[PDB]
Amino acid sequence: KVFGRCELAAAMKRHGLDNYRGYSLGNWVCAAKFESNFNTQATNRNTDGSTDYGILQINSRWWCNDGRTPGSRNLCNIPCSALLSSDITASVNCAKKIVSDGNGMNAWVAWRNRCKGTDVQAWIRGCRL
Ligand SMILES: [Cl-]
Ligand SMILES: [Cl-]
Ligand SMILES: [Cl-]
Ligand SMILES: [Cl-]
Ligand SMILES: [Cl-]
Ligand code: NA
Ordered domains of the chain (ranges, CATH): 1-129 (1.10.530.10)
Residue 55: how many CB atoms within 10 A of its CB? Answer: 31
N- to C-terminal Cα separation, the chain:
21
Residue 7 is among the residues annotated as catalytic for this protein: no
DSSP state of 3: P
In angstroms, how far is CA 56 from the centroid of its own chain? 2
Q: How far is the CA of 66 from the centre of ligand 3 (A)?
A: 9
How long is the chain? 129
Residue 48 is among the residues annotated as catalytic for this protein: no
Phi and psi, residue 23, nearest 5°: -100, 110
Torsion angle in degrees (nearest 10) through CA of 76, 96, 54, 3? 150
Return the SS3 of 78. coil
Q: Is 79 exposed, middle or buried, given 0-12, 13-18 or 19+ CB atoms closer than 10 A?
A: middle
Q: How far is the CA of 70 from the centre of ligand 1 (A)?
A: 38
How far is it, in rounded angstroms, from Cα 108 to Cα 57?
8
Q: How far is the CA of 16 from the centre of ligand 3 (A)?
A: 34
Residue 23: how many CB atoms within 10 A of its CB? Answer: 18
Given CA atoms 48, 83, 5, 108 in this order, what sign does their dihedral have?
negative
How far is it, in rounded angstroms, from Cα 51 to Cα 83?
12
